[PDB]
């Protein structure tokens, strides 16, 4: 059912399939099509086996702006996430170029500013992987505000805790 | 035995005070000026024993059967706690086994089906500690609520979390101090806080109002938002309005905050939400009015009564199997260690009294 | 009520003047039950964790712990003055007489109520008032009425550069 | 130059005004080459770090990136002002429109290049004006033009006392 526990978390686990299977078919696929990887087989790639642990898996955009709540994906275009490099902390963000071609908006610039205060809070590395065609235009001055939120953070953690990029 | 006059303050200031049942006292004044001063008669063990200093006013952390047994309680707090605030807890590091056990997934089916029908919160609390040991304090006390020391990993943890098997679980004056003073207990000696959160709401009743609940509650707010310590929170089922935000919130500064999917995260129940949010397209065609609202209560419980809208906008920080949340709180607390929080410069706060 | 007082004015580093005259803690079930012991306990952490100036002045009644409690020097107050009416004790004299004698009535009690009133006589006119403390320098100083307002004055004047703190912590754990 | 600036001021306590008027970026491949994104972000990193007062006023265009780097309140900024006059919107309505409705003018692009002027027009009176920003809090206020000495002064007046501090470190690491 869906008012007995049992439904509820049943439900749960369909939630998560389509979390983990954001950004459409035949853009998944053309990604592939090139040599490049999901932004969560990239997040694998870097994290020891079983460490990485998912922060806003089921975030949604708040737009209405031109048609851009049709659609509100699980995660909003961006996987982030705590999990340990070679038995070390390390706070991590991957754009999701099959969300919205990885367009950068409001929700998905939140959920950056929070592993970013996270690694911040704990003192562990951020490393960030980048592929985004730019800002998420119907999100209007929203989209910018999220990177100035992002900006103020590199420049506040700079010499604090260490920041690599991932440019894929 | 004896603690009398002005000279029960000196323990009352102490961090926690353990008892022995029948054989020790506290009063500020006797029996016999009670009965002079106000002609009302007590004893002594009603006025100021044991039982009454840990169930009603609040008093005492602990009752123990004899003096040997208050001793090892005793001991028992040392070991959870460090040797001054300087350092962390003492620790006996231990890597826990991550796979999920059959004790893991007694989770999934520990909350019932019905909404009104409880739970033992100590189970879920016994779940993800190391050896199912949890250290219980003040228990005769405000049982709405419990508070307490465990470890995970071999690290000293503690505990706070509603009882809904107890007066539904709901926040009323005397939970809220007991949590505030032992939240901020821990975070003035390093110790992680955990809080389970299963809350309908705040205690109705005159009497919490002239006592003073605005004032007393808020002490628990006021106990959250100042602790630097790592602040993990789970919500196992209700969780409305002001009591949701009370209950170690990410907005007061809760670090990981997760929610099974039988959590009721809302502003308020359904029925009273229908009443305010519909109460015009409810006066209009009021020849269906029980038919209309029922409908409209059955949509907000399907549509709100979740923690869904929670996690869309990171106030919940995942939606998680009630299994999964001993391997959620390990491996949280393993990354939250090195939290380093500092609050403004003061010589110190002015919390509620 | 004055617990959170005493806490506000030394954050916001205002001086604070206590006027005492206290007969001990009001007696009651309610109060016990209430409590007051955990409660009562705030106005103490208050006056020894404040670091602003404190002077106290006690005109008349200052019996047993609610002595203690109002801004005494044992918690810290830096000045202390008493008048001449103040009564600093233990306890009230009935009380004090009951227990200092009590084997010494329980004898003979016949023709022995009455005298019960001498023992009490002495005992007030004996240490009902500032002098013991006084001799301790509990109270620094023993003063007329009267020049109450020169000695805040002047206190204050040299107080007003006062510089104390408490021992390093993240925050203290003031029973709540 | 506004970079080196502005931590010069920053550095010994000195307020910074800005004054925003920027379409956006200057296009060129040497742009690109001689290291736009190492050496544009110096003026980011300048205003971020920056803990001495800062009040920002808009008077026209602020489009996309430039628009957050001109001392935004995103980096920290103070009190922001905007003038009646001000566009502040994520890059031009005809580079916008061109996107936003890229599949609407596909279809059946015959008499079509005509209606492109008019979706343009909606873009420019619905976007690009500073009330989406107020509405979000963006900008602190949307003033007259004749009024912002009053705001500066007044600003400055309470901003005066801003005290601010970065998080604990040897130094920075800004793009050299």
């Known amino acids: 059912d869906i008012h007995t526990t049992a439904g509820k978390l049943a439900d749960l686990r369909r939630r998560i399939e389509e979390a983990t299977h954001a950004g459409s078919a035949r853009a998944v696929e053309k990604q592939h099509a090139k040599g490049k990887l999901t932004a969560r087989e990239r997040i694998d790639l870097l994290l020891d086996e079983g460490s990485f642990v998912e922060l806003d898996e089921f975030a949604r955009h708040r737009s209405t702006n031109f048609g851009l709540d049709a659609n509100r994906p699980y995660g909003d275009g961006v996987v982030t996430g705590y999990g340990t490099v070679d038995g070390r902390p390390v706070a991590v963000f991957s754009q999701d170029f099959t969300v919205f071609g990885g367009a950068l908006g409001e929700v998905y610039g939140q959920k950056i500013v929070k592993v970013m205060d996270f690694a911040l809070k704990t003192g562990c590395p951020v490393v960030g992987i980048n592929d985004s065609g730019g800002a998420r235009i119907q999100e209007g001055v929203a989209s910018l505000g999220a990177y100035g939120e992002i900006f103020r953070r590199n420049t506040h953690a700079s010499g604090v805790i260490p920041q690599i990029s991932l440019v894929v | ?353």
Not at chain 2, 284 to 310: C, F, H, K, S, V
Request: proline share 7%; hydrophobic share 40%.
């Open chain 2, 1 to 353: 035995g004896p603690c009398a006059g002005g000279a029960v303050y000196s323990p009352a200031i102490t961090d926690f005070t353990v008892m022995v049942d029948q054989t020790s006292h506290m009063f500020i004044t006797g029996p016999d000026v009670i009965k002079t001063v106000t002609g009302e008669d007590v004893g002594f063990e009603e006025l100021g024993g044991a039982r009454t200093h840990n169930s009603t006013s609040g008093v005492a952390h602990h009752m123990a059967g004899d003096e040997k047994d208050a001793v090892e309680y005793v001991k028992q707090l040392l070991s959870y706690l460090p040797s001054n605030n300087l350092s962390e807890p003492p620790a006996f590091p231990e890597e826990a086994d991550l796979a999920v056990t059959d004790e893991d997934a007694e989770l999934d089916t520990i909350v019932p089906d019905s909404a009104n029908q409880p739970y033992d919160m100590h189970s879920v609390i016994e779940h993800v500690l190391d050896d199912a040991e949890f250290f219980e304090t003040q228990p005769l006390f405000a049982p709405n609520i419990l508070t307490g020391f465990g470890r995970v990993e071999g690290r000293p943890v503690g505990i706070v979390a509603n009882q809904p098997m107890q007066f539904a679980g709901c926040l009323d004056i005397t939970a809220s101090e007991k949590a505030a003073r032992f939240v901020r207990t821990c975070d003035a000696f390093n110790v992680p806080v955990l809080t389970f959160v299963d809350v309908p709401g705040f205690l109705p009743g005159v009497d919490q109002e002239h006592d003073g609940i605005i004032r007393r509650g808020a002490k628990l707010i006021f106990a959250y938002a100042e602790a630097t310590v790592p602040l993990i929170t789970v919500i196992t089922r209700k969780a409305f309005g002001g009591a949701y935000v009370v209950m170690g919130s990410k907005h007061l500064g809760a670090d990981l905050n997760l929610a099974w999917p039988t959590a009721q995260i809302a502003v308020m129940g359904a029925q009273g939400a229908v009443n305010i949010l519909h109460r015009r397209t409810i006066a209009d065609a009021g020849d269906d009015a029980e038919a209309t609202r029922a409908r409209l209560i059955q949509e907000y419980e399907d549509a709100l009564l979740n923690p869904y809208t929670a996690a869309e906008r990171g106030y919940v920080d995942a939606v998680i199997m009630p299994s999964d949340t001993r391997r959620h709180i390990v491996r949280g607390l393993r990354q939250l260690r090195t939290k380093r929080e500092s609050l403004p410069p003061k010589k110190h706060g002015n919390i509620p009294l």
